[PDB]
Amino acid sequence: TEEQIAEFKEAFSLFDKDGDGTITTKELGTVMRSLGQNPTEAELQDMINEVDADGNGTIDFPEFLTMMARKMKDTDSEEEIREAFRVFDKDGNGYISAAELRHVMTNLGEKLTDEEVDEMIREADIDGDGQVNYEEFVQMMTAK
């Protein structure tokens, strides 16, 4: 797709402010902090070393395109994300407590905020205490 490749090239140019044909951890940390995120020096490498398939430590245009073009909406991704719900499920009946969901989502890992969570719940099936069928979530977030 011509337009797709050109838009990804514009994105690559926006990422690599330095004049070169690659991307290093320095430029990525710069563009990250430019938004006010304050990342560490290890999560940057974790981001980078999972995008390049050459062990070179830096990202080239073809690898960046291979990544950005990777369709993350498939059966493997859906299965993994579905499996990652059943850790928060008692009795494995596919029903999570709305309050339990809010707590486990706001308090753990990359902490969301009140607005984002309140938006995520309002766009799903909420019958009563519990009855939050996460099948609806996995299907709404894996429909491309």
Partner: protein, 352 residues
């Protein structure tokens, strides 16, 4: 809403010491029915079997039909089987197909045989399938299929080698002795098929003793073949055994179940974020505080974060290995060297 969950955990997901007994009782009942199917063939105890087994088949049809109608409801408890089409998707599971088949077919045969005939001729085999009605979740078959799927290459190799050796040695034997008469008046290897019979009997270390070579050439071939090839057709036993043993060895090196909660939460969070960004009118943009040339960099950072989170998660499910250490040390030394470098820079600033 608790009744359904309780009955389902009672019938489908057995746990404790008050349901294992029920399942063992059902299994022993099926075993008694099998045994009485056996005695139906004995000429001595015939008339008793054809009646007792008939009545047992009646009562077991009743019991299993009721249990199935129930299990089509307890399974209605869950969320992936709910609704009409849902329950339909439950009766599609192989074991359910088997159970329906057995129940309805027993009913049909029985009601057709009312007035030692084809009735029993068929029930003798129907009562066999119910042996599959003991393992519900199908963990045994899953385990075996997986461990075989890991070692497909080796098993294919072994079977191919063994079959080739069998063919060749059997033909050589047949060639060495196609006219040597038995000790009694009966030529043994009259054909090639009998030779293959002998080969399949020998190579598996059974030795019925009905076909034994006679000419010394055949005995030499048999000795060499038995010494060489039996270590192939009896080899898969070692492969799968050691595989099971090693896989059990893994089960004692699993990370604490609590050690994978944050990974899953982060995966879910980032995966949702990568979706709420497609809606520019959403509120997820409030995490950065209008902005026009900054949308794409965020849209790609989200994807990178999702991928790294998925990696960190799929890594938090496998057991402890050397990759864990050889990566953790690198990460920690990187952090430490960065700290030392920052301190050096600050000290050069102060002195300079």
């Amino acid at each position: 809403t608790h009744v359904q969950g309780r009955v389902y955990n009672f019938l489908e997901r057995p746990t404790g010491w008050k349901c294992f007994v029920y399942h063992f009782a059902v299994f022993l009942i099926v075993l008694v029915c099998l045994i009485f199917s056996v005695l139906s063939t004995i000429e001595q105890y015939a008339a008793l079997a054809t009646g007792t087994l008939f009545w047992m088949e009646i009562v077991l049809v009743v019991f299993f039909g009721t249990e199935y109608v129930v299990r089509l409801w307890s399974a209605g408890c869950r969320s992936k089987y709910v609704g009409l089409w849902g329950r339909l998707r439950f009766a599609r599971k192989p074991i359910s197909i088997i159970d329906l088949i057995v129940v309805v077919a027993s009913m049909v045969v029985l009601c057709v045989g009312s007035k030692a005939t084809s009735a029993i001729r068929g029930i003798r085999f129907l009562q066999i399938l119910r042996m599959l009605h003991v393992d519900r979740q199908g963990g045994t078959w899953r385990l075996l299929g997986s461990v075989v799927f890991i070692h497909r290459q080796e098993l294919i190799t072994t079977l191919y080698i063994g079959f080739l050796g069998l063919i060749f040695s059997s033909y050589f034997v047949y060639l060495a002795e196609k006219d040597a008469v038995n000790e009694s008046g009966r030529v043994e290897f009259g054909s090639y098929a009998d030779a293959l019979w002998w080969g399949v009997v020998t190579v598996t270390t059974i030795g019925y003793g009905d076909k034994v070579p006679q000419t010394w050439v055949g005995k030499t071939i048999a000795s060499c073949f038995s010494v060489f090839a039996i270590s192939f057709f009896a080899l898969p036993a070692g492969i799968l055994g050691s595989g099971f043993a090693l896989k059990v060895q893994q089960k004692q090196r699993q990370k604490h179940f609590n050690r994978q909660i944050p990974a899953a939460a982060s995966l879910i969070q980032t995966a949702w974020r990568c979706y709420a960004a497609e809606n520019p009118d959403s509120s997820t943009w409030k995490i950065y505080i209008l902005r026009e040339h900054h949308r794409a960099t965020i849209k790609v950072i989200r994807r990178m974060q999702y991928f790294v989170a998925k990696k960190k998660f799929q890594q938090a499910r496998k057991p402890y290995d050397v990759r864990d250490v050889i990566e953790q040390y690198s990460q920690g030394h990187l952090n430490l060297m960065v700290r030392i470098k920052e301190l050096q820079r600050r000290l050069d600033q102060s002195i300079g």
